[PDB]
Amino acid sequence: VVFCFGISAHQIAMHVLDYLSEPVAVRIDFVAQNELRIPEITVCPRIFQQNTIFTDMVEKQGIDKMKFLDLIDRPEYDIMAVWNLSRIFSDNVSCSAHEGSSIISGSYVDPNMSQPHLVYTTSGQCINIPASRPLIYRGVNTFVRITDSQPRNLDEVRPEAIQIYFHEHHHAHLSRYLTGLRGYIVPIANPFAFSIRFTQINYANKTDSPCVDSEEYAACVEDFIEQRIYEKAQVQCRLPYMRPKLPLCSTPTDARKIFVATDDVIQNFEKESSCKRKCEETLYIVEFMHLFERSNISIDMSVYFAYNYIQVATEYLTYTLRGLLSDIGGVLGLFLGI
Amino acid sequence: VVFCFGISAHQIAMHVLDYLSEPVAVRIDFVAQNELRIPEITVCPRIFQQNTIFTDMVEKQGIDKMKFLDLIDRPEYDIMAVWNLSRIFSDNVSCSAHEGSSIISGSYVDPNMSQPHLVYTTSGQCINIPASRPLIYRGVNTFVRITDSQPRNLDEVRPEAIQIYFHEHHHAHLSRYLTGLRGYIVPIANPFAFSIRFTQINYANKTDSPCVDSEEYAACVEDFIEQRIYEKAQVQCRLPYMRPKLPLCSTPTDARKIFVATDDVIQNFEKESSCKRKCEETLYIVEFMHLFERSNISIDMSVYFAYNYIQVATEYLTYTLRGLLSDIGGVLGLFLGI
């Protein structure tokens, strides 16, 4: 019976091996609720070279692909004096929440929401839009509108193909160092509107412990990207956020050249940095819905939620998995009977 | 061994608790079949206030947002004389079934299908299109075309942004009191065509007994919405369908004002009314496919089925769940050995 004992030991070993993690997408189900978890929208030009504004500014002022401090035009260009040159859309941010429709009144609106959160990014400056309040799905017309009624419409060198990144709530790193890579470019010559199908994949938490890694992940990855930028690029002269920590260094091409080089190197970091995962990651399937609205606004990005049926793929954990692999002891006993 | 007996009793209690329902999406699989379950299409203007036709009629005839019977223009406006004022698209309904293509003959058509089913709705009048026959998927060009070759093209105050609601088969309530809320607005200035990805979520039937609640649900919710409209709005003077039951009441602003108010109140009814669920609910993922067809038709809504791979998410029931939770008695016995 030693043979059967060994085979049963192997069966229990497979049991224990499966015990770790074993996340199965138990419920990819289409749940419809009035409550809506709006994506965190970053409205930013994709990159300095791609963006027409930065390229034109550097070409008429400086030389080459930015960098070099633009010393020839002026020796007073600080690091922020060029990084904030990324100003594209801000100071008039509206997260207008068109909640739904109704026969008696209809045209439900909520102008006061989420303010212009100005966040610096590899593009230089973006308008992150926090989810101040979940929205109400009273109809297919559940579209959160991001509007920047800019002065004069900003028709002089208007950004033609600004980028729109729908990232999860409270993620500085995604909005600051991944908006030109993991974001959807959007023309704004017309009032473009995109449906955002929701895939709330709540992964499990085991052997990859997120421990509700929904807010920690953000700061961890942000500081880690900045730390790699500091480390691989051997330049500590750049201003370390607060001025009274190390001397200012903006004129030397260090700040632009080497920092951009390192940030590009650390663009692929999910492999470089690990142990962190948004256990409540929500994916925004961006689709093109035709919009019928003569929106004269400079940018009126209508993030539509025409699908209350969130395809929530909750990556449940099968606790019964361990129970069943232990029940395998029953078949153990049935061999023992043999 | 009383401790082990109690723990095993708890295990069996969890077994019984999981026994109820426990619906897991066993098969979200992409099945391709020639047979196609066409959506029930309602082509209706979203709401009286939103629709240009009703607003213009009331503005030039009556006052305010409809209501008040439009007495000033004429005292003979019955309840139906204004509700049927919703006539937008009807009397020339075609459910043309472009089944597919073929090299020898190609251009497969089926003009005779589903007729103009005129159904009254909160919008006032809509054309529900029953699924008379399942369609054949002989190619990606499997588009059911809803065509209303209206007299004179209806170019006078033509409805610019009519609403299209794809609801499940044989649902009066969805087509009569949820077309302006749970429907997709569609411009008709151009021959718009939408892909309808199919998600046939056949939920289970336990503790929420639908008992093939595919046709009952319809009448139940319809009569319940009408019943709430009658109850909360304390007005029995309105005509109760058949004339010879209670006296006609249309001139008093009751019919419009209070009935619209109550219908708006009961707009969110899935929470108010329960115990009913379409066990065979099919979700229509509406997506924008570019159409290349100079369709001069007033409305030529092409509900495309370019994806034979229906994403059927059959919410199977794990009968083996009970069997396994009973097998837990095997691990019970293995503790008993300890």
Place this chain on the structure above:
Amino acid sequence: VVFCFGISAHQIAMHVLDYLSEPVAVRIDFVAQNELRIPEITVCPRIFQQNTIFTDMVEKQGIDKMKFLDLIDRPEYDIMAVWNLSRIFSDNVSCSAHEGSSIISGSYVDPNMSQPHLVYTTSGQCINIPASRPLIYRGVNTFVRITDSQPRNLDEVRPEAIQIYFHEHHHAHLSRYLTGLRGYIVPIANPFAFSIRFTQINYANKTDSPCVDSEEYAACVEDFIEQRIYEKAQVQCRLPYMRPKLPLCSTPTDARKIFVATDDVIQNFEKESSCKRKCEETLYIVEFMHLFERSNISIDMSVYFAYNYIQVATEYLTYTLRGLLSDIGGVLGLFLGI
């Protein structure tokens, strides 16, 4: 206890019955990887009758819907002399792989890829594009561009609505006898771009043994379609590929008329031919993404991959299914205790 023994025998019988196949979509999970499995693109006009080029050629040269050899215009029209008349887009095929973007350099390109693979098809001639190398997902701008910078732009009778079939790798039959049926028609008057969401459904392998039926399936179905074309159409006079096997027969209307008739008959073959399934079938959800690019190219089909999150629905096999149905012997023993 004979009753319990019989019930347990029935339980084991259900066990064995479930043993066969029982494929559950264990993981429909959204995996993001730099590596991209590009679809095999066939850029072909849908059908001879539908295509404007073939219809115009036959109308001005011959009579009727092709067929009849076009003898009146010229008696030298061989079978290939008309089949290759399907030349629409070829000799300048580029599978340009726009891998991604980057802040330091950006605009990553790879012009050398996959060449003009000229494959004959029911349409007559198509450009199959093999996946020479998996692509890198360094940003949402991961679009494989199929470009045919044709001489003179091919503006004379330019194919307005060419068909684009995204079929799995190394499938001759799909690209040769199912491009006008299982393919998406695409206008080329503008630089159309389609998102290709990936659904890599790796079915199981049991009782439908594919045995990694990823390359065999191709040749099997191709030769079987050709074999049915030969069999049902009683005409062996047509050239059997290699000339020195049977005499050439192209002038008689046999080649066109009867062969097209039979090929149409065998259009629905998945029911006719069985035992073959792509165990690694990948489905391309074709969606419309608006493109901002003034591509003067005649055809610049941008198969975008803006969704690194491949919805891989791996149809795993539950080996633990057999183990649990055997554990049912534990509940067998618990009845025996009763």
